[PDB]
Amino acid sequence: SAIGVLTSGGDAQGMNAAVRAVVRMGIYVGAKVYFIYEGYQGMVDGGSNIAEADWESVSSILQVGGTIIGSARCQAFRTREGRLKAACNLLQRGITNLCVIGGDGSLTGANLFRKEWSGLLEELARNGQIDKEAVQKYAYLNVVGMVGSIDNDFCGTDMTIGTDSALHRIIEVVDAIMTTAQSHQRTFVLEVMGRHCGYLALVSALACGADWVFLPESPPEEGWEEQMCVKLSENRARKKRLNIIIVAEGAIDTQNKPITSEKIKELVVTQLGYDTRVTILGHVQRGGTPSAFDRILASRMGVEAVIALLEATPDTPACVVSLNGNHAVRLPLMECVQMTQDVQKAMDERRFQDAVRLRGRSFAGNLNTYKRLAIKLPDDQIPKTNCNVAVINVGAPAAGMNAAVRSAVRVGIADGHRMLAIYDGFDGFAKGQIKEIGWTDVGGWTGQGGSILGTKRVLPGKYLEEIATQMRTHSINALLIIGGFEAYLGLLELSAAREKHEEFCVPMVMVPATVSNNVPGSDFSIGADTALNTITDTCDRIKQSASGTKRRVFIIETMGGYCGYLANMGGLAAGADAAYIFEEPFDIRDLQSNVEHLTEKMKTTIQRGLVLRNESCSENYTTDFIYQLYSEEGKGVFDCRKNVLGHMQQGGAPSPFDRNFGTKISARAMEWITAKLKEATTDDSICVLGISKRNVIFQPVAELKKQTDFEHRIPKEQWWLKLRPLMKILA
Amino acid sequence: SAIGVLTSGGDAQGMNAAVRAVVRMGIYVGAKVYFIYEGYQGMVDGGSNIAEADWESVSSILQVGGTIIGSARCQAFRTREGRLKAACNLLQRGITNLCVIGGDGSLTGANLFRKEWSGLLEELARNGQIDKEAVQKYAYLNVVGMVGSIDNDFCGTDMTIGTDSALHRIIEVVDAIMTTAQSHQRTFVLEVMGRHCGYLALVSALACGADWVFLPESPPEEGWEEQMCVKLSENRARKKRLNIIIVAEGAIDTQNKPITSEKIKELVVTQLGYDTRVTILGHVQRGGTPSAFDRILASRMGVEAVIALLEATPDTPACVVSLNGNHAVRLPLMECVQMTQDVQKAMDERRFQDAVRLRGRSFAGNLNTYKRLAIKLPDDQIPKTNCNVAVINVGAPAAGMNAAVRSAVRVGIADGHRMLAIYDGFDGFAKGQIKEIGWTDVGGWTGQGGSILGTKRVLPGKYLEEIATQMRTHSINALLIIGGFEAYLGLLELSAAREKHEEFCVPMVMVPATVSNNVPGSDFSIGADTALNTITDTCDRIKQSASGTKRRVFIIETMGGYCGYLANMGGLAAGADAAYIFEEPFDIRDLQSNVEHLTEKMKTTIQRGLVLRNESCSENYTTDFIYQLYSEEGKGVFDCRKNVLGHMQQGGAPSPFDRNFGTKISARAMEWITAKLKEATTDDSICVLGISKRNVIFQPVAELKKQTDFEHRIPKEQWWLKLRPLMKILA
Amino acid sequence: LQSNVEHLTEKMKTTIQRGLVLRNESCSENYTTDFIYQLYSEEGKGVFDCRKNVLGHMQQGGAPSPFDRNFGTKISARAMEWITAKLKEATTDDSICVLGISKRNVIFQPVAELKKQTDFEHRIPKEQWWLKLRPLMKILA
Numbered sequence A, B: 001s002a003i004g005v006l007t008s009g010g011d012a013q014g015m016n017a018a019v020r021a022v023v024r025m026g027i028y029v030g031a032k033v034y035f036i037y038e039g040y041q042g043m044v045d046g047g048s049n050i051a052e053a054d055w056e057s058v059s060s061i062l063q064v065g066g067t068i069i070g071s072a073r074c075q076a077f078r079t080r081e082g083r084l085k086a087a088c089n090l091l092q093r094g095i096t097n098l099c100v101i102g103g104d105g106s107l108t109g110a111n112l113f114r115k116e117w118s119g120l121l122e123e124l125a126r127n128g129q130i131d132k133e134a135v136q137k138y139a140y141l142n143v144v145g146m147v148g149s150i151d152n153d154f155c156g157t158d159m160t161i162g163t164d165s166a167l168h169r170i171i172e173v174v175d176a177i178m179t180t181a182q183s184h185q186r187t188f189v190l191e192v193m194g195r196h197c198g199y200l201a202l203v204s205a206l207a208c209g210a211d212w213v214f215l216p217e218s219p220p221e222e223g224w225e226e227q228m229c230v231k232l233s234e235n236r237a238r239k240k241r242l243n244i245i246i247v248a249e250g251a252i253d254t255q256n257k258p259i260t261s262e263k264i265k266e267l268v269v270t271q272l273g274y275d276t277r278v279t280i281l282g283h284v285q286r287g288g289t290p291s292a293f294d295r296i297l298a299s300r301m302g303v304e305a306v307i308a309l310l311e312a313t314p315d316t317p318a319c320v321v322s323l324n325g326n327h328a329v330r331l332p333l334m335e336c337v338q339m340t341q342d343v344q345k346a347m348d349e350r351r352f353q354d355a356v357r358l359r360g361r362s363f364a365g366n367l368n369t370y371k372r373l374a375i376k377l378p379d380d381q382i383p384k385t386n387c388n389v390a391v392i393n394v395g396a397p398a399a400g401m402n403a404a405v406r407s408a409v410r411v412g413i414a415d416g417h418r419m420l421a422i423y424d425g426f427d428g429f430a431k432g433q434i435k436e437i438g439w440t441d442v443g444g445w446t447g448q449g450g451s452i453l454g455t456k457r458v459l460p461g462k463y464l465e466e467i468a469t470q471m472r473t474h475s476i477n478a479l480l481i482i483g484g485f486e487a488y489l490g491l492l493e494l495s496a497a498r499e500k501h502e503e504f505c506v507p508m509v510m511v512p513a514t515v516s517n518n519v520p521g522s523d524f525s526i527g528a529d530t531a532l533n534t535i536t537d538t539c540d541r542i543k544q545s546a547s548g549t550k551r552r553v554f555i556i557e558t559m560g561g562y563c564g565y566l567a568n569m570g571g572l573a574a575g576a577d578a579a580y581i582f583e584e585p586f587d588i589r590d591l592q593s594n595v596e597h598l599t600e601k602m603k604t605t606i607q608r609g610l611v612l613r614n615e616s617c618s619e620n621y622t623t624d625f626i627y628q629l630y631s632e633e634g635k636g637v638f639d640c641r642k643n644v645l646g647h648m649q650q651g652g653a654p655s656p657f658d659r660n661f662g663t664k665i666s667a668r669a670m671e672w673i674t675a676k677l678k679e680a681t682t683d684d685s686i687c688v689l690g691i692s693k694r695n696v697i698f699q700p701v702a703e704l705k706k707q708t709d710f711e712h713r714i715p716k717e718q719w720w721l722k723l724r725p726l727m728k729i730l731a
Numbered sequence C: 001l002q003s004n005v006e007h008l009t010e011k012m013k014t015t016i017q018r019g020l021v022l023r024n025e026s027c028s029e030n031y032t033t034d035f036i037y038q039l040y041s042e043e044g045k046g047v048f049d050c051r052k053n054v055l056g057h058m059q060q061g062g063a064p065s066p067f068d069r070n071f072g073t074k075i076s077a078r079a080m081e082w083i084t085a086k087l088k089e090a091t092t093d094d095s096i097c098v099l100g101i102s103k104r105n106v107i108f109q110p111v112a113e114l115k116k117q118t119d120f121e122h123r124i125p126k127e128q129w130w131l132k133l134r135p136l137m138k139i140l141a
């Protein structure tokens, strides 16, 4: 009936996408929606800090860091006197539906407010408000929270709006700084945010393959000073021309004593005498522009939040909207606030594995993976099989492939295999471009764009004899492929060729890597976040144009092949007005309908348009056709420009999502390989390791055939199609 | 003969573009060229720190911060014992020509070494070297320096390699931060580099329209504490949701006492009680990737340096290569090293106007312009004319237009005019979209992409009657136009329409703004540095992807109209293999010849290609044609991809060059307007204010007609065409 | 366009399952022969399919048709008669004109007079006789 939305706490990139999603979805469901300026402060002050919102108020906001409606820290809201005055102002305007976008504290605050919402009974016991209105507006205080925080603090949620973006800032800094660690082989201690949370520290570290990291959840344990210094001297012996050490603000040892970045420098300058600087990043990390992931994430939960509020009844407890396993869920607000404090309590009580376990499994996966690729046991202590495992790149280049290779190699070596790097995909395979590869060979790869080993789309079918010859020559006991649809096709071909060539009767696993995200058996592929970010950046600049000129509509063609992932998701994140794709037919009625919408849109103040066309979405309805239609039908009203982005959409260095995705899923694949070799051939030894809903699973290529449209190289059931109605709503 | 190049001192972005330019140009003139690794240290150590360089060695270097060959600080080089050993190693390889890329100290070192050369006579008096070789390799030690430094320290030079890039890092941080300041209404004190130089502080401040700045050249003078605090409270009264204060590392008051950023925070937290943070940026500012300006700059001086060396004779004194007024000059090395110390001596001796005067006029122009737009005299003290001056945007959107508008408005108001903002170019003019605009209305624009007032290409010719009606209605005493060729054409039309419409008999001035840089009467236009960076940014990401297979050529189409500025300069900065432009005809022989070159290039290790096509460089030879030719003729060898960059080249946020160029030239134009109105119509009152070689000048539109190719809307004589031989040399 | 496409669709429920669409080469900037080909192709998808042809420079001809030979012959002779008659009376608008067929009979019209009857920007006249026949095509189809 009336919805109020506010933004409390340390601001986060994506907060604006969320407010936009709540205001638009609220209005779309036919509700009125009120801004509450300056977080809880606006609610305490009242009056004009509360103001109705229309469609136009949330445009030009999406692509912008921080909150276009303010975040106040609000002391007053920690006091009964403040909360009475807040509740009063809400009742003044009939607001009893509340959407609160903030962090641990903001949500602890809203949980407390909700419980206390019979502060109304105080209001009546004074003049405050009418007696009968203590019952009209009673405990139908309907609270829903979304966690907007760069820290990944909150317990319920797998992810928080801001984190991906903050990690972008950190890695932009880290990548920038690595070129100045050559002006002397400098050691840089970088101090990142996460006051009582190590997530942002951990992820950064993993993403830039950092030499050491410090988290409060998981302290170093006694004697690390020497072990770290061994690492950094070993690194000068490996000839590494720098060192990078990532330190959470709230890092501690096993006694809860601060490990400060200035402390670390003194240790390194003292023991080793390396030239050493310390950068305190600070509020950069809250700033800049919201990544495509946060824009989309925030947009999905702005919408679920509005549904959760209207679906709520006086029975339903206050909840927190979350994406767990790429599905939007509601979680009871009380319990999540509780669980988060519990994590502080675990650290406070020197119970560190408990803090880590309570953080979620995700946290522990990052931590475990990081250690494995950062600390190398001496050859003496890693005994193990005389197995030789190969690593190859197949498909077109995808950002993150390199990270992936480095991970596979180190985990294999760590598991005591011997790692063979195969060059140029199945081309180099057929021609025997194979060489042994070690731990140091893959150092500094975690953020390299493209493919250093080299990648080709060519399939193995016509080189089975030659390829089988190479496996025999090099005694290849297993194979890991990092690639796109061509890899998948490659496994099918080799699976079928087993009965003629013994050499292919080994465990073969693939992890998916392409900008296109068209690989069957995985909801995500290494490289697509990078691409979405370049698309998102580009559309932002485009709309800025459309906006200066006014009355202009841009038609923009994107990649994907027949896979409308980049187009669709790119559309959402850029706040386009339409994104045509192959998996959703559209006729000239659909086009005329969008054209008529845009026409009406040019009677408002937002006189711009953004239309995205998947490059292979329609035989006849080409980018030109669409450009010609809209140009012509808008004739009294707007004009158009077509742009074909083409292969620059790939982007450059992989985005952190792709680096870590590359790193994490590849290591998980190698684990599978060693476990299999350890029990020493059927369908179960040739599979795709991919992300399916909640968890990662290995799916035999046999099974994926029936789930695959071979003729357009896209899967048959694609998860992101369920999101199609958002674009149109949120526009 | 033989040339050696080294990189000493605090490293700077663009140092690599310079080494590449020296190696390629050295070889091109048929010299041998040696790397000297690790600055002066490599020269002292000898052996393999000196290594001959071939063509291939300097590829993949251009787009990378810092030095691919090291910078050592070198104590040994401060001692006769070190310099003897250095001189010895040079003679061992016949190196007697030296190119030194560094700063104050590096260059002071090379000047000393030069004077002392015939430390050789010591070499003979020992075993060191043959007696007769003390005369073959004698005082034909030929030294040439280039200044690679982010600080703009050195005196001779107008600009130093690294500054533009560093200012990019700073503004990237400052832009990122503004977002979290809005959110909480925070005051941010940012501490930037410039140990004993205020340039990087000053330019930043101007580029992000900072609320206060602190330079060591120009201290605050007594009573600033209160004056600053008045400013920041006035800013909350204006409802500005943040404050940004830029503090040079080496800021001081009039007594040479440190003004620390932690000191500023205490003053603001104390007197006003605003929420306040401090960011120390640190070595981020030396990092990241070299801007297009530094790439081009460094490339032009790498080349001049090689010429300077071979043209030198034992008479000619060691020099420092510089761009002053966009023309490469040689400056005696001794005198420039002297002058720079003089500036420290001036500050040390509390002689502050002398430090500013010795910094150059450029420095004092930035400082003066900054103050004018940052400090607003109370209405009481700004009396002045009852004149109404209009500001309009004409042409397609260009990054920096907004900065320009803000500057015009404030300088006009400061000059006691009444400022009218005209919306949507001559469209809105004809339709009377005119409104008064004030000081606060333009706050926060300095870094806004696109055009907030709005721009249209439509010309006034068919709306003279209507437009004249608007000037009469609003009593428009003068006009400032920020725009491209359409503005220029617009002034010609209105100039001609004077005799029929009295209303156009006012002073009209235009400042040039377009990504294209095709405006006659100016070597530069507001928006083109942004576009060059977008082009440069994009090629970098392209080269970053596809990595191991290579044998790929990218054909990339750029804007400009018929103006090959973006294409040509973009080509240089991106290190392209060709950039086809309209001002230099090419036939199918030319194309076949480039294709056959690239073919030979794929027999080397650098198997990539980059071809840029100005979008209107040829009717028949389209981007597709070129893509089809190269694709086909490389068939055994390489393959291709075409990309049409399109409307992103306008930009996201304007680059600092464009912001400051926008700000400075617009203010200068408004000055002209007020001076003209003060003497109160012929050709001299309708002109283009533009940058011509060394200095800015107003040129009547009458005079520019003969200097204009009207049919292709480019000027006739274009300064950057003299640079055409570089691309091919440096490739 | 959509209305013609829907007509042809219904037409393919009768026995005359063919279609013929003609496009004047400059009839629309945006609605090109390809656009129309793409629309009809796509919207007929369950029903009919398409082929585009651009006739081009054959439309000039091989040998002229008899109408054109005789028209060429008859009007040119008539123009020469005019020339000799004029030269025989031996300068204003009436000596520079277009000899052309207007309704029933041929007439000489000064170029001065034809300017106001001319769309210069698309090089067609303003009032064109055959446009009165436009309803026939649809009727007779």
Ligand SMILES: Nc1ncnc2c1ncn2[C@@H]1O[C@H](COP(=O)(O)OP(=O)(O)CP(=O)(O)O)[C@@H](O)[C@H]1O
Pocket: A008, A009, A010, A011, A040, A041, A072, A073, A074, A075, A077, A078, A102, A103, A104, A105, A106, A107, A108, A109, A110, A112, A149, A151, A153
């Ligand atoms: N009892 C409570 N506990 C915590 N926060 C509360 C609260 N009651 C109100 N709040 C609000 O939360 C603000 C505290 O800062 P805060 O902890 O909320 O940041 P945040 O949630 O956005 C990021 P993080 O959760 O990582 O701290 C206060 O200004 C106050 O208005």
Ligand SMILES: Nc1ncnc2c1ncn2[C@@H]1O[C@H](COP(=O)(O)OP(=O)(O)CP(=O)(O)O)[C@@H](O)[C@H]1O
Pocket: B008, B009, B010, B040, B041, B072, B073, B074, B075, B077, B078, B079, B102, B103, B104, B105, B106, B107, B108, B109, B110, B112, B149, B153
């Ligand atoms: N008088 C001198 N004689 C010999 N070497 C000298 C010298 N002055 C400077 N150098 C060289 O340069 C270094 C010392 O000053 P430095 O080069 O570091 O300043 P700089 O030129 O890099 C940057 P800035 O612009 O801030 O002064 C030493 O490594 C030394 O090799």
